[PDB]
Amino acid sequence: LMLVINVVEDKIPANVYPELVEWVRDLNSIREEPIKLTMFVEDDIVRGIMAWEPGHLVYMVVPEESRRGGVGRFMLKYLQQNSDRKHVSCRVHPTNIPALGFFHQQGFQIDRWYIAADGQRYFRMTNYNVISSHTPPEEKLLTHYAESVPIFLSMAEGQFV
Amino acid sequence: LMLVINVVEDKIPANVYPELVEWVRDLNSIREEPIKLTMFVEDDIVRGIMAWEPGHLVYMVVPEESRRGGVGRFMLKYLQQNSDRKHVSCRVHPTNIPALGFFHQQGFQIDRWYIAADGQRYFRMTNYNVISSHTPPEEKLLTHYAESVPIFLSMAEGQFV
Numbered sequence: 014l015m016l017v018i019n020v021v022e023d024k025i026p027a028n029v030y031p032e033l034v035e036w037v038r039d040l041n042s043i044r045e046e047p048i049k050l051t052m053f054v055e056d057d058i059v060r061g062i063m064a065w066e067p068g069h070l071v072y073m074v075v076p077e078e079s080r081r082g083g084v085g086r087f088m089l090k091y092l093q094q095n096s097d098r099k100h101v102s103c104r105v106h107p108t109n110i111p112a113l114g115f116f117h118q119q120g121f122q123i124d125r126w127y128i129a130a131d132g133q134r135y136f137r138m139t140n141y142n143v144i145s146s147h148t149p150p151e152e153k154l155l156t157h158y159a160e161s162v163p164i165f166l167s168m169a170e171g172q173f174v
Numbered sequence: 175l176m177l178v179i180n181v182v183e184d185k186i187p188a189n190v191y192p193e194l195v196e197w198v199r200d201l202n203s204i205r206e207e208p209i210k211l212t213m214f215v216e217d218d219i220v221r222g223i224m225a226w227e228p229g230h231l232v233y234m235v236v237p238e239e240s241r242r243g244g245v246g247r248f249m250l251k252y253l254q255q256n257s258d259r260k261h262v263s264c265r266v267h268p269t270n271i272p273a274l275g276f277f278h279q280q281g282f283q284i285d286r287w288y289i290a291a292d293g294q295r296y297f298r299m300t301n302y303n304v305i306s307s308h309t310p311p312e313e314k315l316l317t318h319y320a321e322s323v324p325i326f327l328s329m330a331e332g333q334f335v
């Protein structure tokens with residue numbers, strides 16, 4: 014029922030959205046095929062907006078009032094269905110741990126890290142399924158001990174102190 | 175009301191918990207002061223167990239049935255109150271994104287990354303408050319556009335198709 018509409022980038026009113034027009038132009042200056050800018054609309058609410066191309070997510074945002082409702086999951090699946098082998102790459106700053114949690118829940122893992130030219134740090138997250146996930150052995154050892162060890166300690170303050 | 179008890183490491187029954195005894199011994203083989211192993215008990219349930227020393231978290235686990243109840247937050251605060259300047263360091267595998275979300279919510283950030291000798295990757299997370307958090311400018315540009323742009327599209331299937 015949700016409406017999926019693409020933004021005609023050359024018809025974006027530059028007098029109203031100057032910075033957005035510049036950001037989109039700079040993205041397309043290094044590209045043969047132009048980037049896509051897609052909005053996901055319910056009634057009179059833009060539930061989410063996503064800048065993307067087949068196989069790569071540039072940026073996406075769900076406005077705060079629409080979060081934790083599956084909108085982000087819907088946009089990423091729409092991106093995969095328009096992607097070769099449904100494989101997608103993205104970039105996330107290491108401080109954006111909430112976004113890391115979102116992508117991780119969607120089957121993505123950190124497979125590259127680097128420092129950009131201006132000094133910023135970034136992770137690449139993909140769903141290529143090469144990275145192995147590793148659970149340390151001490152987690153099981155501690156869990157079994159915590160559940161199984163006998164404890165005979167009684168102390169509550171009631172009639173005595 | 176929760177009981178906080180330290181495990182006497184030399185009295186751990188080696189016949190019952192051989193691997194745990196070995197893991198604790200290997201941790202203490204490179205240490206002057208021995209590690210601490212603390213359990214957090216409610217009634218007959220060990221809500222959480224934590225291997226730690228002042229200023230450094232080695233490992234902690236809340237059993238699945240006790241999670242998302244603040245137990246993990248309670249243990250980390252207990253660790254800070256027994257830490258110089260309440261500063262703590264920890265190590266998290268990059269695939270353990272759920273743990274990254276937990277520590278991030280407690281005021282921690284990734285401040286170091288490395289590859290260990292056996293090939294494993296790790297982040298160091300601290301609450302030292304040196305790392306700056308960075309929100310990209312395009313998040314605001316996309317949010318303002320999504321909320322403000324006029325949209326005159328009407329399409330619902332009712333009396334017409």
Ligand SMILES: CC(=O)SCCNC(=O)CCNC(=O)[C@H](O)C(C)(C)COP(=O)(O)OP(=O)(O)OC[C@H]1O[C@@H](n2cnc3c(N)ncnc32)[C@H](O)[C@@H]1OP(=O)(O)O
Pocket residue numbers: 070071072073074075076079080081082083084085086087103104105106109110111112114115116118119275313
């Ligand atoms: C686009 C890039 O490459 S990086 C920049 C990412 N965008 C941003 O950071 C902008 C600010 N944040 C947002 O707009 C949104 O929070 C997004 C885009 C990250 C996710 O949008 P949402 O619609 O809220 O995600 P969605 O509702 O589909 O949640 C799916 C699962 O992802 C996980 N998840 C989502 N958000 C979070 C979070 N903040 N922390 C931890 N896990 C999360 C949860 O497991 C969630 O399932 P649940 O709600 O049942 O617990």
Ligand SMILES: CC(=O)SCCNC(=O)CCNC(=O)[C@H](O)C(C)(C)COP(=O)(O)OP(=O)(O)OC[C@H]1O[C@@H](n2cnc3c(N)ncnc32)[C@H](O)[C@@H]1OP(=O)(O)O
Pocket residue numbers: 114152231232233234235236237240241242243244245246247248264265266267270271272273275276277279280
């Ligand atoms: C110890 C180290 O250095 S690394 C290894 C960490 N331990 C493990 O991975 C073992 C398996 N996991 C666990 O035992 C637990 O999930 C822990 C220890 C990570 C956290 O224990 P919990 O008691 O569940 O954490 P707690 O209830 O205090 O939650 C505090 C906040 O942290 C965040 N948080 C906690 N768990 C998660 C998660 N799985 N994903 C994203 N965010 C989380 C939430 O914001 C939560 O607040 P909320 O419940 O209101 O949403």
